[model samples]
Target chain A: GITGTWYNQLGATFIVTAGADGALTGTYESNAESRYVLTGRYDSAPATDGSGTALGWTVAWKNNYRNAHSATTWSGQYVGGAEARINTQWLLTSGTTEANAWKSTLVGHDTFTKVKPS
Target chain B: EAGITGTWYNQLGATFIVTAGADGALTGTYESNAESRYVLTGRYDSAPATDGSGTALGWTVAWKNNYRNAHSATTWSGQYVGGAEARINTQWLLTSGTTEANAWKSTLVGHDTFTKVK
Candidate 1:
């Protein structure tokens, strides 16, 4: 249940950790899983920043199975303030026989939740 | 944990004794029934003592029944005979009478080697 919320912008970058040991890591175009382009059509409600300004979008990634070296897929959804856009395919790795040998990428805006400045 | 040893009897009233050896090893033989055939066997985790009473921990009896006709299916039941601890020359009674349909009780007698789990 690991999810990441970020704003949308051109040339943004996000790192995706893959495999069992968290050894595989890669960077992909913001909002893109490798060649798979995720458009704003799936964006959800605009999430506000500390200044209450709506961020561009939010993306969530989830891993379903518990086994390593097994077939795995990831899903992504865009979120604005009101509602989430239809979820989009951020990226999916080909099934691998080796343990901890797969990786992927994602991109989007990164914003901190509103919190009173201490 | 100390090794466990015991003996048992079979359906045809055949007896078997078992002894324990190193590393919880067990060895025993099946005493022949009236037909001079080995019908029951027993063994223990370690070598048995020269005296008759090595260990008399626990014993178990299992019964299963099978029928030929669908309307006359067979059933099985069992119960423990003696109390806990070692005993000699003990006799157990398993009384079962049937008048309903074609019925027969097949018994499988065996004992367990228990090691202190805690």
Candidate 2:
């Protein structure tokens, strides 16, 4: 199965397309790629080890856009953002789906959120 | 695909045995001056081990002339002597073959084993 992994404002959004052979196609969004555009209130705190910090935010949109595994090519965008450490966990707002089906966690230090124009 | 293996005694005080199993293959066992330590080293030798000296104690075959001819014929040799004190590791190359292969170059020098008479 072909899959894309990424992070976004709505907590790590993913788009998944299903194929006939139980394979899934996934497109991912990245938080670092969307950092400039994401803005909102977040519960921010330092990481347990203090090496870094994290920001927890309840995404207004169903995290349905983030965290996905599917069998077909799917693409979508997530809007909304909050300050987060490298190791922040982006929770999902809606029930999981093939397109957006999982909680996406962010590492406080090395998160990239750039979306190349398709 | 040709392989070679042999043992060597250096005038210093060390002894080494090598088992190379391909044109560039190199594997050897070394007993250092300190009886407590032995080092096993392996790497690609420019020439096959079968091109050394002394029956079984040295290599004596022309396995890969093509690869062997390109590089300055290089050889590997080592030796250790007397009471676990002075030791040396040496390297050499096969300059000629057929009857008595001529070793023309020496590359490495280090301490390893003591080849003492029992």
Candidate 3:
């Protein structure tokens, strides 16, 4: 299963758990600065991205605090072999159709690396 | 076509006026707190990002402007809204310097919107 713990290059942790037929839920924590609840799905078979970059999957997340709510359409795709597990994207880049008024800071080259549960 | 020409100003005491030619080329002037009579020139759009919202056209813009001879690319993404208004989103990279037009640039981060006033 494509379910487990993951982290980005900056060591922001993502804890993921999967359900039947691509269902997913998770939590994201950035050290002590920020946190969010994540909900997305895994695709056993999907179409390539509109740009023909990679096979893409749909993902979304939200962070709520101080009357602020940011829920963005997340784009994820493997950089190499699909099992190689490299992913990066932002709502501001590809998914305004599902994004809020605000956008994540321009942090390019995001990654989602699977790690052993601890 | 609803062309971008004539004079427009923002609340920050910035003034912009442009002369767009039939050849899809443009020349303009910008005056602001940090710049005065800065010569601005660029193409209107390689093409456009037009909408079916009765908008004549929507487009991305790139221009060269100088601040004390420090040249940088100023970008904008705009769409024509209903009535006499247009939504102009200014694009700026967070890390900027004399060579910002080239390497070590952040993804086109958004700065602010320039509400049309003409």
Candidate 4:
């Protein structure tokens, strides 16, 4: 029931919907099918924004272009409140070797905040 | 006087005056601004290999935060960039908090460009 639309300070839209399994299925259309993807699990834990809301989450930015399907990083900045203040830094996940797990450039440090319905 | 015993400073704001102690373990002062004056200590988890050149090291630092009454730790891995400096990456973690879990594991990372104080 936590389905809603989210936006960041940059005025970008990130839409989400909850599935029957209670897992999140969403489209973070920040780019050409290479933007947002849900990464964290749904839990009964309180939201990170301090409002103690049980609607917390985690996600990552990704760029699955060609041989480099990668999403390396993200950050959580919800300082005990009701809204998520998130910024992310994702990198490539094209590990040529299991031992080396090589990496390349970063995708973005995209920031977002859940949109408050007017 | 040329390995792990001396002062190293990051180009940004971190400063570490590390001393090579008994059995190659380490003791040190790792600090940044008054809000970050801390007691940092670590152990050379891996023996630095010289390879007839200089040296490279792997270590973990335990940091005590006096300002926020919290704790965090970092693992460092890097090598001497040259005769004058050593470059390393330090990942920061909260010892225990509302934010840290999985036994205080997270990918909060930072870098150091250490310059010799002597």
Candidate 5:
């Protein structure tokens, strides 16, 4: 049901496919145009509601010229239906090579909407 | 931006302590299983809200396998509403098991309202 193209408020874009077996596959590109592969799964039901779905996905920034070792994961939900907007939170770990540990991680929020129904 | 460095209690009665950094990174401790204390890492950013308030934040906790939890990690994302009683309204995704096969069955999704301890 989450199979489609998604565009976030920051101009990042991704396309996700939900397998019959619940596996999630996709590709994501940040606003920087850094490409990353996606790996995650979808849960059809959330604990608070029967109609919503939860999504979790991760990506490694190998293609990122800024910090190739950085990694990020997204966790959020579509609170109503497949066509609903997705509200998510994301945490990103900067490259391990950074000397300042405090600068190694960052957190942010994203709102995604389906751009095309696949 | 408003600071989030403080002790917090969630709907599950779980407690966590967060330390905010100048670089947008978050380091903290989480209480799990009513006994297990674990480290958490995450990020927070001052994303402008339409209402001209609040900050977006996301964090993750990896549970130690010493107790009931095994190979599990929970990620939370949401907005930090700042005020006299600052609060974090978040959605969480919990993933368990060693394998991704049929992982959706064990995955859990829910909402958490974390109130900053006075």
Candidate 6:
């Protein structure tokens, strides 16, 4: 049910495909870089409701050898019925040193809507 | 609340004027170039001293985009270090709601020490 091309308020596009066994795979396209690998899992509360599925996903910039040295994780709910939206909170952590690592987390929220189904 | 409720100035020339309620509510304004003046809402826990974890101060600014720039949501997490003048040492993250190709500017991180002025 979560398989689709989603766009966030920040203009980041995510093409996600959720397998029947809870495996998630996708491509994350942002203005900052090319497509990065997206992976995570979902918990289904029910099939009839859109918000029934709780979604959690991540993007590893290293997957594409982009040299971005960062990892991002997002967790939220998918409102798939009439709204077709996903609201999520994300944390982006970067840097290699302990000094930078201590305060590397960037926290924010995103509201995404489906533009195309996969 | 003496440890946190007051006017503070950061190195960026921004002004943060806040009031901490007894119920741990924090109400303030982050006056800066981003929004001219943005309302802030968050929580604060004041202690006799700052041990890094116990005396916490965190807040958020949902930029109004009044300056015609990109819409962004910014958050700060830090602790109130009580002293003769007091200081709020914080790390901030600002995420834009528009496409930003520059990774360094897109997911930015920095530290600020706000000294109490009043």
Query: Each candidate's chain B TM-score?
Result: 0.27, 0.32, 0.55, 0.61, 0.83, 0.78
Per residue, candidate 3 scores C-alpha lDDT tens digits across A1-118 of 3467777777767776655533345666764337654444333233233211121121212223311212222334333344445454443221121132234223345667664334
lDDT of 5 by residue, B1-118 (tens): 4468889999787898988676555667788454587656565552333444455556666554234333455777555666777787666767543222343464566768899763
For residues A57-112, write the lDDT of model 1, one tens digit per residue.
Answer: 11112112121111111222222244322122222222222232223212222222
Native contacts retained, all candidates in order: 0.00, 0.00, 0.00, 0.00, 0.02, 0.00
The most accurate candidate by TM-score is 5
The parts of candidate 4 lying over 4 Å away from their true place are A1-118, B33-35, B45-50, B61-63, B81-106
Tens digits of lDDT, candidate 2, B3-97: 23455565655465666454223344444335322323222222212322111111111112211221111122221111233222222322221
What value does the lDDT take at residue B73 in candidate 1? 10
TM values, all candidates: 0.18, 0.21, 0.36, 0.39, 0.51, 0.47
Model 6, C-alpha of A61: deviation from truth (Å)? 31
Question: Of the pair 2 and 4, which is ahead by TM-score?
Answer: 4
Off by over 4 Å in 6: A1-118, B33-35, B46-54, B65-69, B99-106
How badly does each model clash, as a count of residue pairs?
Answer: 26, 54, 0, 6, 3, 0
In terms of lDDT, which candidate is strongest?
5
Per-residue CA lDDT of model 2 for A1-118, tens digit only, reads 1123344334545443323321222333445342111111111111232222111111112122222211110111111235321222221222222233222211122232434224
TM-score of 2: 0.21
Q: Which candidate order results from sorting by TM-score in descending order?
A: 5, 6, 4, 3, 2, 1
Per-model lDDT: 0.23, 0.25, 0.39, 0.40, 0.61, 0.58
Candidate order by decreasing lDDT: 5, 6, 4, 3, 2, 1
iRMS, all models: 32.0, 32.5, 16.3, 12.5, 11.3, 12.7
lDDT of 5 by residue, A1-118 (tens): 5788888887788878866533456788875567655655555323442434555666655443443444566765554554567666666644322134345456677778866323
Candidate 4 chain A, run of 10 with poorest lDDT: A49-58
Selected candidate, larger TM-score, 1 vs 2: 2
Clashing residue pairs, backbone N/CA/C < 3 A, model 4: A49-A80, A49-A81, A50-A80, A50-A81, A70-A93, B71-B95
Runs in model 3 with CA error above 4 Å?
A: A1-118, B33-35, B45-67, B70-73, B98-108
